[PDB]
Symmetry: C3
Subunit: 99 residues, 3 copies
Amino acid sequence: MKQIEDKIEEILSKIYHIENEIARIKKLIFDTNEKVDQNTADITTNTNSINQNTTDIATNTTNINNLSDSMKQIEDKIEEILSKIYHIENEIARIKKLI
Amino acid sequence: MKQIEDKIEEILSKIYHIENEIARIKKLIFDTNEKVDQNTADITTNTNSINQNTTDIATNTTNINNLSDSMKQIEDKIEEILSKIYHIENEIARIKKLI
Amino acid sequence: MKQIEDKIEEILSKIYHIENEIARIKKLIFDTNEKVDQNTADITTNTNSINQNTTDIATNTTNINNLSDSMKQIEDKIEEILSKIYHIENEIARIKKLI
Ligand SMILES: [Cl-]
Ligand SMILES: [Cl-]
């Protein structure tokens, strides 16, 4: 009756502490899940942005390639032009000798 | 003994409830970690993607600079071509007057 | 009463085991949060990389558009230059026939 009720006093006080710890734990878990859900939200955003960026890069890469082809064709024509202009200047110099 | 038995009955009931809470809490934790691990997997994919994209942007940026530099040369050459043509046109107009 | 003693010892053991389970649960929670906080740190790094990449893409996109514009203009100028040259060659042919 003195040790048994000592024992029950210990049991009930431990149970009450455990109840508190369970309450604190539930809160920790809630607070954790807020962080986790915020992370999932942020990840979803980033995933969408990466997708868009990957698409915009692909497009940019295609266009660069396109512009590169065009540039080569341009450089080609310009070399022809400069060569033709040189022929012309020499034609003119020959004509000026005959007048 | 009757009072102690009543106390034991309440104790056992509380302990039963605590055990259920704890089982519930464990489930919560493991479900939380399913999400956390999927988050981590998704971050990993995104990081790889961000890395590919960063490289691809670097390449595109270099190609753009190179095209921009070629373009500047081309524009100078067109300047030169146009002045040569203008000179030629003058020379031609003069020659036409002499013949 | 010897049963009562068995039962209290039973109870004390179960409470001991519950306390250990609580301690284990807390550890799980803090370990979970280490993963969560690392995820948060990694998401932040990725957000910053994405924001930079988005800007750089925009810059590149603008520059491609500007180069494309420039090249379209050069192509127009070449079209005209080539016309000026056909005409010049015609004139020169005419001059050659008159001298
Ligand atoms: Cl780009
Ligand atoms: Cl997370």
